[PDB]
């Protein structure tokens, strides 16, 4: 009586149940694991807070309306302030982590709409100015708020044009990245497990984000007659196999 459909994920002191899942994606078919010695470089023993950092943090909720263009969060940024995960983050020189991402959106059998939930490794954004204008730090570190693709261009911020993925590629091809759809008629959640993907064994958690999670409405939300025209979307994310190394004074970052 197991269905692909019902699932439970327990991680730390927190549990999620979905009764309307559509399997789960594990990026590149690899599950998060700690850093092996053969791959290690820094000689420091690392710190593995385990259950105090590897639990589920639910970010603040978004509201899908008929005019929504899509939202974008960066990792580990989105979690920069969650509990002890965040403290560890500002206090060590280097850290590394994988995540379980669970995006939630329920409706009824009269609604229609379909969101794309995708994880993009190394999502370098484009400046809407063109040329070689850079995208300032603050703009690519929105924190739990994430970036709202239907917000206005700002100065020093990225471009927010959806048919171009914020980088000069077409929305249609985002499907080459680990992703899952939430089609109100099928699905009510999306779950993706992200292994740590980098060109170095461990890195800085503040100067470099290693994935952007993106939720994009593709088939517009259509509510039943005289229904309220909107649904909330909630994102809950859990660091998994986290390791921190090179402890010290506590980083100070712009803004």
């Amino acid at each position: 009586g197991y269905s692909d459909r019902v699932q439970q994920i327990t991680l730390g002191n927190s549990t999620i149940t979905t009764q309307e899942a559509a399997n789960a994606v594990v990026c590149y078919a690899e599950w998060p694991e700690y850093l092996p010695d053969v791959d290690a470089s820094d000689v420091n023993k690392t710190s593995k807070p385990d259950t105090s950092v590897c639990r589920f943090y639910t970010l603040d909720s978004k509201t899908w309306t008929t005019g929504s263009k899509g939202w974008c969060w960066k990792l580990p940024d989105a979690l920069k302030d969650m509990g002890v995960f965040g403290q560890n983050m500002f206090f060590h020189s280097l850290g590394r982590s994988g995540y379980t991402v669970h995006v939630q959106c329920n409706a009824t059998k009269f609604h229609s709409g379909c969101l794309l939930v995708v994880v993009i490794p190394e999502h370098q954004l484009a400046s809407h100015e063109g040329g070689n204008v850079s995208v300032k730090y603050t703009f690519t570190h929105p924190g739990e708020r994430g970036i709202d693709l239907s917000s206005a261009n700002e100065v020093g911020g990225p471009v927010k044009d959806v048919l171009y993925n914020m980088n000069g590629t077409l929305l249609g091809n985002l499907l080459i990245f680990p992703h899952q759809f939430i089609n109100l008629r099928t699905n009510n959640t999306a779950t993706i497990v992200i292994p740590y993907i980098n060109s170095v064994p461990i890195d800085s958690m503040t100067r470099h984000n290693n994935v952007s999670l993106m939720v994009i409405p593709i088939a517009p939300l259509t509510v039943p007659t005289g229904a309220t025209p909107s649904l909330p979307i909630t994102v809950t994310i859990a660091p998994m196999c986290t390791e921190f190394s090179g402890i010290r004074s506590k980083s100070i970052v712009p803004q």
């Binding site: 789960a24 990026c27 590149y28 497990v193």
Partner: protein
């Protein structure tokens, strides 16, 4: 025959002949069998 000492100096590599699209085409956690229902 390599005439040179360093590995960078050798010619192109030879075909992976690796080929396994499943990391890209089927990264699902619970295995899906073709023919069985997608969602049970």
């Amino acid at each position: 025959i390599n005439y040179y000492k360093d590995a960078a100096s050798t010619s192109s590599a030879g075909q992976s002949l690796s080929m396994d699209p499943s990391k890209f085409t089927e990264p699902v956690k619970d295995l899906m069998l073709k023919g069985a229902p997608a969602l049970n």
